[PDB]
């Protein structure tokens, strides 16, 4: 049975997502323009990631209990989850019609070629597409999508976490909300093993995060590429 507290948690996270995800993509005009061995898409996609980081921080701040953590722990959690939550939240714009992230317009529709033109390789891009396809196929309720993003952010095993017991206590409240939501509100057959499949997406994200950081380190080690990043991206992903 979904308790009053669990229904409240879901309502907060749905509101938080509403306040931090703009399905009109209006702000994309502000980024450096996309250009389709030159990394022609790096300025645009770095600006897009920088913008997305700001949205993920805004969502995180509204997760019940996140503000009770120390500043150090909030920082560790956001730095370690940012690319994973961006990959998750990007699934909303992903389409299996042509395996692209379609942000409202042809200029802002990104395929595997565009991602390679920001400097990433098939080692990341192939499993990233497989993740987007597998997540899209779960046909998550919006409630499950926002819970999964929150559980991803509040992970007690991230490196450098200090108060791992409090992080785990916050995450457990979200995990039990999600498990009870699936059991009470997701009708079969779509609910079949859904919680385990969602946790599997969190394990897939760790692998994607490790590969992203490897390729980010390689690309940002070249100062000509670092010059095209943003200050926020350099702070979050490293310098």
């Amino acid at each position: 049975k979904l308790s009053e507290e669990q229904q409240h948690i879901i309502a907060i996270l749905l509101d938080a997502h509403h306040k931090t995800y703009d399905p009109t993509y209006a702000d994309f005009r502000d980024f450096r323009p996309p250009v389709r061995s030159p990394l022609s898409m790096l300025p645009h996609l770095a600006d897009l990631v920088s913008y997305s980081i700001q949205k993920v921080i805004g969502f995180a701040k509204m997760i019940p209990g996140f503000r009770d953590l120390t500043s150090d722990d909030q920082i560790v959690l956001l730095k370690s989850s940012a690319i994973e939550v961006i990959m998750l939240r990007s699934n909303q714009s992903f389409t299996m019609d042509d395996m692209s992230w379609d942000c409202g317009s042809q200029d802002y529709k990104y395929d595997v070629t565009d991602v390679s033109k920001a400097g990433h390789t098939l080692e990341l891009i192939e499993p990233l597409i497989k993740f987007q396809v597998g997540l899209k196929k779960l046909n998550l309720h919006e409630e499950e999508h926002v819970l999964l993003m929150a559980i991803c952010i509040v992970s007690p095993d991230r490196p450098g976490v200090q108060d791992a017991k409090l992080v785990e206590a916050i995450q457990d409240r979200l995990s039990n909300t999600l498990q009870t939501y699936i059991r009470c509100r997701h009708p079969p057959p779509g609910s079949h093993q859904l919680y385990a499949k969602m946790i599997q997406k969190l394990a897939d994200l760790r692998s994607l995060n490790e590969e992203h950081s490897k390729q980010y380190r390689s690309l940002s080690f070249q100062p000509e590429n670092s010059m095209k990043l943003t200050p926020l991206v350099l702070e979050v992903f490293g310098n």
């Binding site: 921080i57 701040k61 730095k79 200050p231 926020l232 702070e235």
Partner: peptide
């Protein structure tokens, strides 16, 4: 380990 932009966005 100075994260002034993150710190500032966190409040």
């Amino acid at each position: 380990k100075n994260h002034p932009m993150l710190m500032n966005l966190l409040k």
